[PDB]
Amino acid sequence: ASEVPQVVSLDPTSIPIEYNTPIHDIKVQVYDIKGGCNVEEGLTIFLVNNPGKENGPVKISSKVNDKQVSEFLKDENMEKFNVKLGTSKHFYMFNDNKNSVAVGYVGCGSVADLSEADMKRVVLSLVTMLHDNKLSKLTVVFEINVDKNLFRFFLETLFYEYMTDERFKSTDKNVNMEYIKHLGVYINNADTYKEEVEKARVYYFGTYYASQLIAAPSNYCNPVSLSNAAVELAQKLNLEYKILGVKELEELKMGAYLSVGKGSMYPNKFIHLTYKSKGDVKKKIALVGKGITFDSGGYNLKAAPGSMIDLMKFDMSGCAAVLGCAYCVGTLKPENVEIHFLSAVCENMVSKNSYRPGDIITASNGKTIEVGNTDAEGRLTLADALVYAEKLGVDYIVDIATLTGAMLYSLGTSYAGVFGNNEELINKILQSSKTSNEPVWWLPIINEYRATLNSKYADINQISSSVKASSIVASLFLKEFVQNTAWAHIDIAGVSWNFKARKPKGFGVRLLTEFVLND
Amino acid sequence: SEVPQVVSLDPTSIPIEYNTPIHDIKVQVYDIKGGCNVEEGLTIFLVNNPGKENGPVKISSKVNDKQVSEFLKDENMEKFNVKLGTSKHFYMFNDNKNSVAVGYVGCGSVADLSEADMKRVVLSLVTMLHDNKLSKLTVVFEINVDKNLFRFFLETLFYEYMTDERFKSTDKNVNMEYIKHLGVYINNADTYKEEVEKARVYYFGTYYASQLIAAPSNYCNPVSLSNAAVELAQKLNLEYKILGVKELEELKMGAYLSVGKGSMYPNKFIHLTYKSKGDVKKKIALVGKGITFDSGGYNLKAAPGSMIDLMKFDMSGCAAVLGCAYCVGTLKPENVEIHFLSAVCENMVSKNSYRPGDIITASNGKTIEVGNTDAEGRLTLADALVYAEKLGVDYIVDIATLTGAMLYSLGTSYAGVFGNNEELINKILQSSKTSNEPVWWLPIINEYRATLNSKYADINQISSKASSIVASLFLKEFVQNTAWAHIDIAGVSWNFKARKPKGFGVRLLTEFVLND
Amino acid sequence: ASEVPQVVSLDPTSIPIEYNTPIHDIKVQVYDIKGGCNVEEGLTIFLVNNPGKENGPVKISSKVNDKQVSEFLKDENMEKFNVKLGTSKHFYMFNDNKNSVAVGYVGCGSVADLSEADMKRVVLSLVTMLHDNKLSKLTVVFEINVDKNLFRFFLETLFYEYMTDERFKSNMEYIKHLGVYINNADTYKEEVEKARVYYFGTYYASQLIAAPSNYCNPVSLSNAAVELAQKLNLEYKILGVKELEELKMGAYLSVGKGSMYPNKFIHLTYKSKGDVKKKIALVGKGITFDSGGYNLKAAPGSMIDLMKFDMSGCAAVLGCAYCVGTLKPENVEIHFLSAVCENMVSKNSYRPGDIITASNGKTIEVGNTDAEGRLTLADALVYAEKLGVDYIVDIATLTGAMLYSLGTSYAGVFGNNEELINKILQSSKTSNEPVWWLPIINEYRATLNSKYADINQISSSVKASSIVASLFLKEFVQNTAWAHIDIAGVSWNFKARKPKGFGVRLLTEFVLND
Ligand SMILES: CC(C)(C)CC(=O)N[C@@H](C(=O)NO)c1ccc(-c2cc(F)c(F)c(F)c2)cc1
Ligand SMILES: CC(C)(C)CC(=O)N[C@@H](C(=O)NO)c1ccc(-c2cc(F)c(F)c(F)c2)cc1
């Protein structure tokens, strides 16, 4: 734990973190739908669809253990409503014990298998029913088909979207902020789905924890304060930790990493968390996250129209995702595995002490790098991070980074891109993507472009000057720093930020965790 | 107090000229009914011709000289016309057989000169003063002007006549000589006499503001500017207080302190106070934006036409307030208590600078999400407006070079005024009429308030296009229950044609204080 | 009706126009709230606030004549919800007679005085429920404070936002009944049919604007004007290129030169049956598409894809023409004018630097082809003052600077006559179409001095474009009271991706209460 430097005494010296969220107070009960649905206090929502019939009528199929509610929800009354994806309706009636109840439904389209995006729409429609309504209990009746992974995804998404981050609110807190205390779920073959509930709660927070870190502004979330939070997290989870300061980094000759942070008031802090299983270890994995707490661009300042310099607190999303994974792994405690969580945290700033364009710097593997652009600082920090990671002697090195903005032009805001030197590892990422429902796509490392990184003076150029394929060029650059290890690179620069909702996604936490677990 | 330097050659004070050549001018006002004596220097007639556009010049005044009167007869003067801005020089011998200079400046055919027309008239008259080493100027008024317009003539004459040579060195004007005497002829002269010394007060306050603004950022930094304000206060016997960083920290001014975090100069909060002897009926707080230099911060002014080299003008609001302070302290109005405020700092790029995206806390507890570092003015004004309201005043009037959007709305002549109180706005509009400083009332549109709703903080700093209106909506959030008005002078502060400050707002704020 | 030229046989030859809308089929009843409410049919929505507590709990005061709904509306239930402006909830249930009804609310904030901006948010919340409604009846219970004008605004807005334009397409059902419970109902009833007239006047203008440039061209726009005039029994006249050349409208014609569509000048006339006491000319800018000419809109943010909207001034005048010809005010004679053309890049286009001559003889030096609206208005104004009217009011999407000045909500008004400007402002207040008075600063006039022509079209330096354009237009009105309304910023609703029909009601209130 290191002291955070301040310019004025009003400068924050730590990131506020909410561990005990209202979600953790919610008691979750899972009932088998065969036994019928009890409709009591709170709000009972049925998830219905109508296969084939686009915007077809609503039909409740479950047994409802109440004569009154059954009559209300009979087919001929429900037919005036439809199952259009995103549609919702509220019902009000009295049950058999003469107690008023609130019932409703959410349309789930006319397609049998809902994609992760469709399910997210259903959750969002469901969440609006939770907002501005002081409910004590929510009951969800699944009348659609979901496998165990999609059921978990439903819960995680619900917990995430329902949650509101009011850490930075002061005079403008929602005076009506009131969370439900009970969640009931009716589903076919409930005994098989029950194991997903706690996994969802663990996945939710790991995602929401990374979200809190990302959403934290660059004056709260700096290299020192972020490394402090990693320490606290590790102390709560009994993870081994090591926080490397500038001096050790100099001794390890991390010249590429150090140059990036030269222009910052905050000293570089290299984060090293370690989870090791108690049993015999059969797999060693290093998970690397890019940790630029603020990216001004350096002397290559982000001043072009649309450079979104104000959003650049998000450039440690990779680090956040890695730390969120550290929570999920340290909590669920997988066996036969050893995971290193790495992040070379620093801050790309403009100063008299900054690194300059044209500077030639030496990485910790001896390779000299000519800087052609100070705004491509991520691949520099990752270079030293990758070399460090390989010295640990692992089987897999996976890095996750908000690296290139060109991802928005290639995959957009929904799908992340994965690059690598090992096809087996890449397939495991794609498999992890399926089971976590965090969309990833395999993109090529095109060797024909490697020649454009040939520097006249240094061993290698940082950027190309004749190739607009930035995501591939950067992957080619990073590949030059992994000598003999299966390695994959996930570019989340396009998917890390939910633009419509103006908030982080916490993308990668579940993806990386499903990777650790299913191995 | 002590100005920090990078090298020894860095200046540690703003050069300021108090005793200007204008203050060495003896001003005499005579009644035109007794006629004009024409003996020495240059004598200029302000003549018009109501109706006839570009009509003939006719000297109506009685001239107490046979030879000069003969020269100025209609027969001789018919060849000249009264087109606004026209000037002619005449050369002749008077009765004493002394050569003498006589001329005129045409004042159009409209019987009511406006603020713009009178400025053209003065400018022409000033051109007759430049490059002509004269010891005396007499001006004969053959037009109809009210007391406030006659005063505006003098203030403007004095302002345009004076040349700022504080930073001249090997290029000082070798031929620059100022007149030592000024004569004025006008109808009902006893009425206009009091306006003379009021004009000299109004002029210097405007020129004092002009000097501070023109002073470059390496000369005019927050420390040197707060030093100057103290020097001003000590001269005028005003109560003064300069709040430094650690005091500001205690007052929790996080917004204002964040803006200045990057600068090598400590933040300095200027607090001057004039208090009349006797019963105070009105308590007023005047707030001036005091950014000694606006680089833009990490949102650097690097766009084409961002005019970063002119950014020394972002202290103009503060200058206007200090200029007003001189006027008020000199004229000493009664039954009022005036607080002169300016949260002075510099907006720089550094490892210590505030960033786009920072969530800062204002002194009233509201958390603000910083969308753009170049919108730093409203951040400093936020803490200043809270401090001001804490003084229990009746009126808060802030003046600021806030938004460049003003150039597209009102332009370079008219300032914009916003507010939460219609009575206060009208008073500003009234003072605009009497100070002859053009000001237009622009609305604070409440529908736009939603665009400032922040996801994480209490409020957004910027809306991420009606910048001026949005900036006012922001400032409204820091005035709880006081009549408040906001004057945006970003477009009218600088005279691009003359390449110099206007000192805009000094006379406006003084007229507001005096006539209240 | 002139023939609309085509490049291919697939190019349309008229603007699709819906006159009979489902809104005209809605039967409206206004009851007094002091008598209580009947909630036995369809959707009932309470407009409630909480002046005492910001985002405070919902409490329904009205007594309803149904036991089931009375239980639903008890304070224990409603306090689970809050009145945050725009927030809404609605529930389906059975009433006492076992009929299906729906009951809900819309939060109206904690301020007793509702602005038109606030009311618009309330209506939008209401409409969102209507777009998911299949019920036959909507009942709106006003448990808040509205005067006669804001209530009419509520109806016009409700109608306008409810109606959806589907002329170019290749869920819900429109209600047949609207019930309203409000205090002093008898005083409000007169505002209903006025709201229906104002609605279609606005929606008609909306239809013209939204109609794309391949549909809405000078020939088809003027054709629709003729058809509107015939339906309302207005005197009309469409001046063609030959008549325009005779009248020497060289500024107007220079803009259209590069277009495949011949310039058309629209002149509609309403005249009262009795004695004519006031004469008015309403002038609308009618650029059916603004490419920018050789000063092409290629800069980032120039938004060339939206420039079908630059005839919004023309549409608003035609929209007003509908209301006037329908409401038939006495003692007035109104002229509806628009010099309609298209600003295109061609070998025939006018060029930057061209010196053109207006119908009043003034030579103009063109500095920017993208500033073509003021050129066409210049000749239109000269035409307007020749009619011998008391008031000339032009309305135009003139300068993008309005977005930086007043924004997207308030229009700017400029003029030479303070009395006319006040009437505009008063019309703005009664119609709830917000306008703000901006100055015509004479000091800027010198920037329009041309070296070779009588006057410059634009300024080289001055960025106060809205003011500079006003000074320009001022040179084409010799001695008639004249006002200019710049709606370049308020014409298009960007959040809803559709026109606002801005100006119709403002202009109609102007002619009706003058
Ligand atoms: C290859 C380079 C440095 C010339 C351009 C680039 O890819 N820049 C990166 C960057 O600065 N990484 O440290 C970059 C990454 C994300 C974004 C980005 C911009 C947005 F406006 C946005 F919404 C987003 F999600 C990402 C922009 C640039
Ligand atoms: C709202 C924002 C920050 C996007 C653009 C803005 O209004 N900037 C202000 C500013 O920096 N306030 O601290 C601003 C104010 C005046 C001017 C300005 C520019 C000129 F070229 C000019 F001549 C002038 F007089 C003022 C430019 C920007």
Ligand SMILES: CC(C)(C)CC(=O)N[C@@H](C(=O)NO)c1ccc(-c2cc(F)c(F)c(F)c2)cc1
């Ligand atoms: C004076 C000039 C031509 C340099 C810039 C200008 O004011 N152009 C006008 C125009 O082309 N009139 O025919 C103009 C008017 C509205 C808009 C405009 C732009 C928007 F992005 C927008 F959303 C809007 F509503 C209007 C842009 C330019």
Ligand SMILES: [Zn+2]
């Ligand atoms: Zn970067």
Ligand SMILES: [Zn+2]
């Ligand atoms: Zn980066």
Ligand SMILES: [Zn+2]
């Ligand atoms: Zn700025």
Ligand SMILES: [Zn+2]
């Ligand atoms: Zn500023």
Ligand SMILES: [Zn+2]
């Ligand atoms: Zn145009």
Ligand SMILES: [Zn+2]
């Ligand atoms: Zn146009």
